[PDB]
């Protein structure tokens, strides 16, 4: 409802950063190490 909706998109990744660049740098290390057995990659909203 703002005339430039960049913060409201980038807060919830309508249009923000990619799914591997905003996270804390341990969690990208965690989610790729636990790739086969405990996959948590479907909870982080890769935007297009």
């Amino acid at each position: 409802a703002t005339p430039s909706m960049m913060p409201q998109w980038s807060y919830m990744h309508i249009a923000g950063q990619d799914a591997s660049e905003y996270l804390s740098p341990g969690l990208v290390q965690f989610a790729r190490a636990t790739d086969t057995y405990f996959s948590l990659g479907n909870k982080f909203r890769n935007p297009t």
Partner: peptide, 29 residues
Amino acid sequence: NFASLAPRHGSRPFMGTWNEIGTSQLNGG
């Protein structure tokens, strides 16, 4: 760079593989 043409997944543009530039479709190839 031509980064303003690719449909970006997020901030990184979607740049394809290197076999997506030619073709070698012959009968038995």
